[PDB]
Design a protein around this ligand. Structure first.
Ligand SMILES: [Ca+2]
Lengths: 538, 713, 181, 246, 289
DNA sequence: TCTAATGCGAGCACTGCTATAGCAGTGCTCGCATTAGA
């Protein structure tokens, strides 16, 4: 029926043949309403979204997905839930079905299966009976000295060593690296006789890289020499090392770093490649954009961190480390909570300032953030600028001066690859893909200033980058990083977005924005589709 | 100028041979007088679409469409994706028709399966929901299209929608003026014009237009069916001749045309054969004019014989005449065009060679004929073309061959140095045995002879044989040993379109069940449910890592719905040595079809390592050079010689002969089951089995296969 | 304006599957199984008739009546089969007196076989019940009232000539119609 | 077998990019490489990209001038024809290879993609024996080889000396298709009624005699046939030798 | 094996060909100019979301099939009398275009008929049959190879347009030079060269102004076409008109980009040039020497 | 890396009986020719 409209929507590039052909074959002979849902389900699907909230579908999209056009949309229909469920290409989950309506969420059966598989993993972790807290406590007291004032890295370790699966979330300012290190020294130390193969791994190869060149460095140190048949210092990207259940991996403990990039599918696939007797320690940044964009899971898994440990778990940790560890709030989602642990920066004099303070600030409030521009005039590190009107041309300038080094190595013909190491010194980042801001638009409006003067993926060399989406920069860094927020608008510019942008900078960091957009960002927080939240509260 | 009766059939060859030695030897050419149709991809492609309404949509035929770039481009499909679509179409079960309507319209029972919609459904279904999970609307999802790649299923499906939209629209008759716009609509609907095809596309619209206009002119009342139009287009497209290069970029190759006699220094006629040149076609026969002829009248015979004259008359320097002297098969003799006969007959009868001045009419005439006729050689590399004189070839390219100046292919196998990396997966000692020669190719020098495509059944399944019957038996088996419900498996299989329709599918099923049950029982009867076991065997300076599934406290209990074979024995022996060296003390059985059975006695972890070492020794040697050992033939010979009684290795002449037979029965099979040695891998080392290498095999495959026989049952 | 068809081997095969499809798919398990036992599939039909179908059709000595349906013959056959399936579901008595050497008491082997040859039919097939007939019963006081077995082993019991006849008559015209179109 | 190799070779040419599909073509026996060769080219990454260029070079010729022209280029380089001919039975192979190229060339002028052609090969390799045109050509020289032919292709032919090694074989006709002895029409008995099979069987040697008569008759000076106390009946040599049925 | 092969001692040297302002237009046109000798070779492409619900000549199907449909229109017209719309619905109906284009098209044809090509009288509508010659076809022999360079120098000197110098994009050619002239008409003493150019879907009006045109002119180096075409008309007239003079009879070259032509916005859509007369001179003898 | 033809009788082994030997019938193993021909 809707055929024309859909097929047209394809002429108008607002959804692909797959979505409508999927829609057509599966519904097609049902209430056009269910037909539309499938199209859009498969569409959000294409953007990495695991499910499609009945909500993004009840009157709001009258100002969202452009197909708010209809003669067939009989009212707000309200009984969307009913219409769907009646059609039988959707089921609550009993019948084998293309689609699943669980929560007030519509799913492509594969997705919903993949979600549940992840829920089951974290509500099935058992307790590493490997207790003798007496002994664990000693090996930890010996690996963590400054445990006088609650050592969160010491806790992480204890959590992780008493659980089969465990997640450690932390910002860049934390010894997540060094913690996983003592964490394992202790695993090795506590392996009476033998049989403990530790294999490392990251989702992206660029990550896998660092894992080793830092998980080794920090690891060869610490007092351990009782034969170092270490961490098999071969990392491997997650999408290497597999290719499964029915042929589980060979290892006792798996340490996945950059966990914030694991996506729903990647999870469920890794899960299956895991033999019941193995221990998985995931490391990641809960408030990094990759943990919240379409298809991610870290963000939702670590959501229940704010719930703290159950009391019994708390008491045990405090018994394990030599410090009282807080708890609170009954035991909903006990199995998850009791095996998560996020780190915090520790104690020193002076500052962490510049990138430091702003970053922390960004993970919360306005008053905090505004008072770091004014404060100390951090001159180097921060560099806010007022972009509006013609100060757009002001930016284009401090933009050609930033890329200074690069452009001169070009001119000075030093044609090696210092041109390469010069480019990763300055970098423009923008929330949008198209526009006066955003990439496409920014590259031009910049190439112009510079003529009138003069493997897997995401490896540079003008993919007409010059400017990147804060999104693609994930897992990268530059000395001077400049961020450009739109003039006034978009939900794409969120708190996480801004956070991960700032955290891309190692020295100077400019933020060409307005104390309206920025602050509006700080207060908005990437929407979160999904059912995990609820699959965890039962 | 070069002329042939049919320029369309010489074209391929003209083009081929004039693709030659770039410098020196090269001279320009253009073919003229070819038929638009026969000389353009899209034209046929389009006549083809004009028949959607009469099509049975067979798989290869739809897929063929995608071989026309412009069409493939229109639905955003690249050669890259086409490769997948091709694989999916085959696996999802597509064979025949578009719809069920289509099938029905063919007065054939709609089965709901095997049509495009079925397979396309299975793939979209498989986009969401994975294969397990179960059948949906009597359809099992197909999961190769699941990830981002599924995006392809979309494009494909869109293409099949379009085709259906048109098969139905071209279906019914229309009044002339109504057909007017169909052509220009189908073009834009299926082709994304190139720059070339743009010209070709315009050519269709013209012919199509002119056709309809001409009808409208005569004011044709009645409605007209597509065939009437499609056929006229076809014909019109076959009479349209392209000869626009007829006199620029030189050396004109074309047919002899009437009313186009131009002077040329050189004129050559090819394939002037009897039955080919004076070209024919009998008048309609109800052509009054042809029976009572008059001076003005024309006929092809006369036109054609007069063209052969105009040729003679227009050549100013040299006339070249050629014909084919005999088909290169039955080697029977040919004959020239009577017109050519007449030409050398009148030459001969009016000339004589300087030598022969006093010999005879008939005598001198023959010599002149024999002197101007120049029999040529079958192959371009025959020495006679490279001697000196009358047309030695200007093609050095074939000189070496001509002079037997080549160097015979050097014996393939040359021992490669090899150092064994302490620690090789079990799987690699598995993959290596169970066909070692193949292994040297695949493992040592990463050469896998993968052949791109594979026969797509020209039809739904009526019968179940070979690989399928195996893949189906595989599960039916595991499901009966697991004492699980066969009925559930049957519906999934039926849901995938793997069984023959209705009762026929059930019947087929019921019987695999029976044979399969009979095996399942020998298994059920001695299975003691255990678990995995991880492998980390230190053995002969190398570790071995991997999983041994279902390890029972008795030993390993294996099974396959296949006949008993030596390669399958070795398979279980490897597994046995490994689990026995892993400590575990116990047995290991392999239950096969027709009651086959390889059963191994428990082995001391000490002797287990000794044995698991020759096996690794083999893998080691066999990575430097193809290690012979043909499990089937070797073990065939090896089975007839070896005796359980006293472990009697027989040598009497009576048996060393029955042996050499069995080996050979095995090496080159029957006319049905068919032979070990018929295998790219072996074929690449020797095309015929020499008595010397038969030996190497025997000895070699004795050395590695013996323990198998010294320990069975 | 004719087009000289060259193959015809594929044209013939396809006609042959069309035949099978429209004459077998719609068939109910009892008949289907019967056919199946005569030919596993259309490839095997063609293998048995392909020669004919080509050039002049031979005359069939004794064709089936110009109308017997698969359905009919089946009936007649089944019915000839079951009436003897009843006069045996009564092996109550068959446990007989007067001897002979050849005929052993491992006849109790022969027995049950057919006793158990009492399925819900589906096959014109019937493993050997030679002994328990009556024609040889005498050839080896002797036997009773199952002279209905003398009668079952007289009449051929097959669907073969009927289907065959139908196939070539039909497969030919399929080919023909296709070639005209 | 030579077709299979041509198929690998073409795949190689249409995409030398894919390390693996090229290695396979270089491995075909037609190219004449060594195990030692294949190995070393796997360890010398500069040499490989050289072969890769060579192959990119072929695709170009293919795209512009045709499959035959490309194949001839390839052959002149790897000096194929010359070497093959030197290699025993190598003439057979070489002329088949050329023959495939002549077919490959026509088929190309009816496809506007190289890949289509490749696909065209696969098909013909998976479901052959079509025309007499894809039949094997006999080599000029087969003329000096003893010639082994069938009784049928021998009708018409004349030979100085002929051998009939198996002229005693029979094979009983078991299908009841016979000609009516009075009406002379062909009758198919759909019930193997013995009277008709008997009539069919007669018609069978009625035919072998004709075959024998064609067989003895091809020679000019001499002919020798093989005879044996042939038996097929599984009747234990009961003074059998059903040689009288041939 | 006492063998060897004949090697030839002649050499390639020169190539004689028949070219036609294809020395320019790179291939793709392979077999294009072959299957349809008069296809609107100057067009090419697809068209998209530029559908705006009110038909304007800019939304007329893009490319060559449609392009040569237009040329067809002006092949046999009665520039003289008014445009029947029935006639037009028939052209569109026969060429397979939707009838609903008749309103926009008939209104388009007249506009383009009643435009002022060279201000002085002009306007196609004032041209009776006897004063037009449609699709003339010329053949110019061109001896002494024509080197892309040597032609560049003088093309530059005499033409302010071809001063946009990227040229000499072709290679040496002796031979012949084919060519079709869309229309040649006369206006009482004075012969002209007209070239109808259906071309590109560049949104609207903004693209058919004296520069933009002059622009596209260089993109497709159409300037080459003028000079060639008039060298043709020149020679032809000189051969026909006994005692003719280039500057007493010529003064032509009009270029109608069919789109971008309104009833009241002259100098929009049309382009005019009048080759140097000193160029033709050299050019003419640049062929024969 | 996947599977791998049937089918027909013989052939020998063995097991009831009944006027040690012949007549018969139960059952698994095994060798054999199958296609054709344009
Ligand atoms: Ca024009």
């Amino acid at each position: 029926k809707l055929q024309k409209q859909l097929l047209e929507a394809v002429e108008h590039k607002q959804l692909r043949p797959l979505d409508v052909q999927f829609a057509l074959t599966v519904a097609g002979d049902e209430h056009p309403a269910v037909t539309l849902a499938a199209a859009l389900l498969s569409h959000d699907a294409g953007e990495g979204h695991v499910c499609l909230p009945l909500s993004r579908l009840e009157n709001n999209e009258a100002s969202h997905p452009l197909l708010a056009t209809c003669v067939s949309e009989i009212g707000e229909l309200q009984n969307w839930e009913e219409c769907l469920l009646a059609s039988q290409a959707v089921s609550r989950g009993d019948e084998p079905t293309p689609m699943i309506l669980c929560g007030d969420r519509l799913y492509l059966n594969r997705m919903w299966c993949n979600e549940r598989t992840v829920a089951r993993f974290f509500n099935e972790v058992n307790h590493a009976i490997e207790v003798d807290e007496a002994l664990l406590a000693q090996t930890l007291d010996k690996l963590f000295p400054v445990s006088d004032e609650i050592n969160w890295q010491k806790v992480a370790a204890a959590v992780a060593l008493t659980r089969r699966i465990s997640v450690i979330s932390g910002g860049p300012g934390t010894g997540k690296t060094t913690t996983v290190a003592k964490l394992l020294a202790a695993l090795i130390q506590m392996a009476d006789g033998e049989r403990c193969r530790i294999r490392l791994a990251a989702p992206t190869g660029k990550a896998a890289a660092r894992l080793t060149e830092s998980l080794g460095k920090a690891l060869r140190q610490l007092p351990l020499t009782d034969e170092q048949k270490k961490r098999i210092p071969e990392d491997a990207s997650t999408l290497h090392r597999l290719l499964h259940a029915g042929n589980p991996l060979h290892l006792d403990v798996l340490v996945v770093d950059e966990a914030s990039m694991i996506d729903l599918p990647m999870m469920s696939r890794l899960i299956d490649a895991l033999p019941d007797h193995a221990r998985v320690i995931f490391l990641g940044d809960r408030d990094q954009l990759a943990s919240v964009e379409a298809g991610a899971v870290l963000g939702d898994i670590c959501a229940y961190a704010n719930a703290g440990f159950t009391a019994e778990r708390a008491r045990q940790l405090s018994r394990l480390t030599g410090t009282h560890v807080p708890a609170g709030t009954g035991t909903e989602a006990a199995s998850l909570r009791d095996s998560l642990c996020l780190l915090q920066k520790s104690y020193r004099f002076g500052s962490d300032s510049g990138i430091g303070q702003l970053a922390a600030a960004i993970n919360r409030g306005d008053k905090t953030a505004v008072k770091t521009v004014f404060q100390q005039d951090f001159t180097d590190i921060e560099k806010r600028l007022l972009q509006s009107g013609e100060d757009y041309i002001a930016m284009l300038e401090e933009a050609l001066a930033g890329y200074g080094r690069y452009l001169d190595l070009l001119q000075a013909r030093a044609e090696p690859d210092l041109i390469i190491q010069a480019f990763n010194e300055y970098q423009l980042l923008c929330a949008l893909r198209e526009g006066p801001f955003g990439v496409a638009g920014l590259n031009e409006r910049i190439e112009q200033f510079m003529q009138q003067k003069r493997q897997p993926s995401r490896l540079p060399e003008h993919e007409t980058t010059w400017a990147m989406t804060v999104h693609k920069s994930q897992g990268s860094e530059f000395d001077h990083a400049a961020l450009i927020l739109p003039s006034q608008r978009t939900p794409v510019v969120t708190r996480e977005l801004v956070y991960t942008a700032v955290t891309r900078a190692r020295r100077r960091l400019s933020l060409y924005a307005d104390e309206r957009i920025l602050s509006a960002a700080i207060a908005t927080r990437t929407e979160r589709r999904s059912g995990l939240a609820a699959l965890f509260s039962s | 100028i070069v002329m042939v009766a049919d320029i369309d059939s010489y074209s391929p060859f003209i083009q081929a041979v004039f693709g030659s030695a770039p410098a020196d030897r090269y001279l320009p050419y253009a073919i003229s007088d070819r038929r638009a149709r026969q000389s353009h991809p899209v034209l046929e492609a389009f006549i083809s679409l004009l028949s959607l309404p009469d099509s049975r949509f067979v798989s290869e035929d739809v897929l063929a469409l995608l071989d026309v770039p412009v069409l493939a481009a229109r639905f955003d499909i690249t050669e890259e994706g086409l490769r997948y679509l091709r694989q999916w179409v085959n696996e999802s079960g597509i064979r025949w028709g578009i719809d069920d309507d289509n099938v029905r319209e063919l007065e054939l029972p709609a089965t709901g399966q095997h049509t495009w919609r079925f397979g396309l459904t299975r793939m979209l279904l498989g986009y969401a929901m994975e294969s397990a999970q179960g059948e949906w609307q009597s359809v099992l999802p197909y999961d190769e299209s699941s990830g981002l790649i599924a995006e392809l299923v979309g494009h494909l499906a869109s293409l099949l929608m379009q085709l259906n939209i048109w098969r139905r629209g071209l279906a019914q008759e229309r009044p002339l003026e109504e057909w007017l716009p169909v052509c220009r609509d189908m073009l834009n609907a299926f082709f994304l014009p190139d720059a070339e095809t743009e010209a070709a596309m315009t050519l269709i619209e013209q012919q199509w237009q002119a056709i309809i206009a001409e009808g409208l002119g005569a004011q044709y009342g009645d409605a007209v069916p597509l065939s009437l139009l499609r056929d006229e287009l076809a014909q019109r497209l076959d009479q349209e001749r392209i000869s626009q290069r007829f006199l620029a970029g030189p050396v004109n190759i074309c047919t002899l045309m009437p009313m186009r006699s131009i002077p040329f220094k050189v004129v050559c006629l090819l394939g002037m054969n009897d039955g080919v040149y004076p070209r024919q076609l009998a008048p309609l026969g109800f052509d009054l004019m042809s029976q009572k002829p008059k001076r003005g009248d024309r006929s092809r015979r006369d036109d054609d014989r007069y063209l052969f004259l105009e040729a003679l008359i227009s050549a100013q320097q040299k006339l070249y005449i050629s014909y084919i002297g005999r088909s290169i098969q039955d080697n029977s003799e040919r004959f020239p065009s009577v017109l050519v006969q007449e030409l050398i007959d009148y030459i001969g009868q009016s000339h004589y060679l300087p030598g022969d001045e006093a010999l005879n009419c008939d005598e001198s005439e023959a010599r002149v004929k024999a002197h101007l006729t120049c029999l040529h050689t079958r192959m371009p590399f025959d020495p006679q073309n490279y001697q000196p004189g009358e047309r030695q070839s200007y093609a050095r390219e074939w000189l070496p061959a001509a002079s037997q100046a080549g160097k015979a292919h050097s014996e393939f196998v040359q021992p490669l140095p090899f150092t064994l990396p302490e620690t090789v997966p079990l799987e690699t000692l598995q993959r290596f045995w169970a066909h070692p020669v193949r292994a040297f190719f695949q493992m040592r020098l990463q050469v896998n002879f993968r052949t791109e495509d594979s026969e797509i059944p020209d039809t739904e399944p009526f019968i179940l044989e070979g690989l399928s019957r195996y893949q189906i038996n595989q599960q039916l088996l595991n499901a009966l040993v697991e004492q699980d419900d066969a009925e559930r498996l049957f519906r999934r299989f039926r849901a995938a379109g793997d069984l023959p329709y209705g009762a026929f599918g059930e019947i087929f099923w019921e019987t695999q069940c029976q044979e399969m049950q009979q095996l399942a029982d020998r298994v059920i009867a001695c299975r003691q449910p255990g678990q995995s076991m991880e492998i980390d065997l230190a053995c002969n300076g190398v570790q071995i890592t991997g999983w041994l599934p279902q390890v029972q406290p008795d030993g390993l209990l294996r099974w396959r719905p296949s006949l008993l074979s030596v390669a399958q024995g070795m398979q279980l022996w490897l597994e046995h040595l490994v689990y026995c060296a892993s400590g575990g003390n116990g047995e290991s059985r392999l239950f096969l079809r027709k009651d086959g059975e390889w059963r191994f006695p428990p082995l001391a972890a000490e002797q287990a390592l000794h044995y698991l070492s020759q096996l690794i020794e083999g893998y080691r040697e066999g990575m430097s050079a193809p290690l012979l050992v043909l499990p089937e033939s070797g073990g065939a010979w090896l089975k007839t010689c070896y005796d359980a009684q006293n472990d009697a290795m027989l040598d009497d002449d009576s048996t060393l002969q029955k042996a050499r037979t069995k080996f050979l029965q095995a090496y080159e099979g029957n006319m049905m089951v068919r032979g070990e040695g018929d295998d790219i891998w072996y074929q690449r080392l020797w095309r015929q089995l020499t008595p010397e290498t038969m030996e190497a095999i025997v000895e070699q495959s004795q050395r590695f296969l013996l323990p198998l026989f010294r320990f069975n049952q | 304006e004719q087009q000289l068809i060259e193959d015809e081997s594929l044209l013939r095969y396809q006609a042959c599957a069309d035949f099978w499809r429209r004459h077998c798919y719609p068939l109910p398990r009892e008949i289907a199984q019967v056919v199946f036992e005569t030919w596993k599939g259309p490839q095997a039909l063609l293998r048995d008739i392909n020669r004919y179908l080509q050039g002049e059709a031979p005359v069939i000595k004794a064709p089936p009546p110009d109308d017997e349906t698969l359905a009919s013959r089946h009936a007649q056959i089944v019915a000839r089969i079951d009436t003897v399936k009843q006069q045996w579901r009564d092996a109550v008595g068959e446990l007989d007196a007067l001897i002979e050497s050849s005929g052993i008491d491992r006849r109790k082997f022969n027995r049950s076989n057919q006793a158990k040859w009492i399925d819900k039919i589906s096959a014109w097939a019937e493993e050997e019940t030679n002994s328990y007939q009556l024609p040889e019963s005498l050839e080896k006081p002797r036997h009773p009232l199952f002279e209905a077995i003398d009668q079952l082993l007289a009449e051929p019991l097959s669907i073969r000539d009927l289907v065959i006849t139908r196939a070539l008559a039909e497969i030919r015209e399929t080919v023909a119609r296709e070639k005209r179109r | 077998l030579e077709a299979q190799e041509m198929l690998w070779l073409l795949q190689a040419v249409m995409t030398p990019e894919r390390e693996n599909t090229l290695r396979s073509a270089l491995a075909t026996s037609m190219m004449g490489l060594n195990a030692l060769d294949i190995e070393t080219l796997n360890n010398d990454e500069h040499a490989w990209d050289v072969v890769v260029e060579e192959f990119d070079g072929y695709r170009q010729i293919w795209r512009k001038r045709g499959v035959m022209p490309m194949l001839r280029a390839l052959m002149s380089a790897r000096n194929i024809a010359e070497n093959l001919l030197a290699t025993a039975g190598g003439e057979r192979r070489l002329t088949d290879i050329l023959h495939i190229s002549e077919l490959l060339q026509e088929a190309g002028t009816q496809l506007e993609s190289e890949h289509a052609l490749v696909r065209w090969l696969s098909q013909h390799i998976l479901e052959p024996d079509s025309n007499a045109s894809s039949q094997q050509m006999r080599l000029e020289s087969d003329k000096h080889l003893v010639q082994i032919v069938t009784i049928h292709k021998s009708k018409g032919l004349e030979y100085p000396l002929v051998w009939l090694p198996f002229i005693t074989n029979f094979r009983v006709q078991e299908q009841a298709f016979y000609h009516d002895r009075h009406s002379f029409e062909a009758v198919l008995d759909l019930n193997a009624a013995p009277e008709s099979v008997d009539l069919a069987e007669a018609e069978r040697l009625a035919e072998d005699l004709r075959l024998l008569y064609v067989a003895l008759t091809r020679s000019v000076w001499h002919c020798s046939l093989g005879v044996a106390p042939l038996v097929r009946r599984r009747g234990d040599k009961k003074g059998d030798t059903d040689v009288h049925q041939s | 094996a006492e063998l060897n092969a004949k090697t030839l001692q002649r050499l390639p040297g020169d190539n004689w060909r028949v070219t036609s302002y294809s020395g320019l237009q790179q291939r793709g046109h392979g077999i294009a100019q072959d299957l349809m000798p008069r296809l609107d070779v100057d067009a090419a492409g697809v068209a998209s979301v530029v559908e705006e619900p009110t038909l304007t000549p800019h939304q007329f199907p893009r490319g060559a099939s449609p392009g040569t449909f237009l040329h067809s229109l002006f092949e046999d017209l009665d520039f003289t009398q008014p445009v029947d719309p029935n006639w037009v619905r028939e052209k569109l109906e026969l060429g397979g275009f939707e009838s609903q284009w008749e309103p926009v098209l008939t209104e388009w044809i007249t506009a383009v008929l009643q435009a002022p090509l060279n201000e002085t009288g002009v306007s196609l509508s004032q041209l009776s049959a006897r004063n037009k010659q449609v699709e003339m076809e010329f053949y110019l022999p061109i001896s002494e190879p024509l080197i892309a360079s040597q032609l560049d120098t003088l093309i530059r000197q005499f033409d302010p347009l071809s001063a946009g110098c990227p040229p000499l994009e072709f290679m040496q050619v002796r031979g012949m030079l084919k060519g079709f002239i869309d229309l040649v008409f006369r206006h009482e003493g004075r012969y002209y060269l007209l070239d109808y150019k259906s071309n590109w879907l560049g949104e609207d009006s903004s693209a058919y102004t004296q520069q933009a045109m002059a622009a596209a002119m260089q993109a497709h180096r159409y300037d080459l076409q003028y000079q060639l075409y008039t060298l043709a008309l020149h020679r032809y007239l000189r051969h026909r008109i006994a005692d003719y003079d280039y500057e007493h009879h010529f003064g032509g070259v009009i270029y109608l980009f069919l789109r971008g032509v309104d009833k009241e916005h002259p100098q929009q859509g049309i382009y005019t040039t009048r080759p140097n007369a000193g160029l033709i001179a050299l050019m003419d003898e640049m062929f024969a020497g």
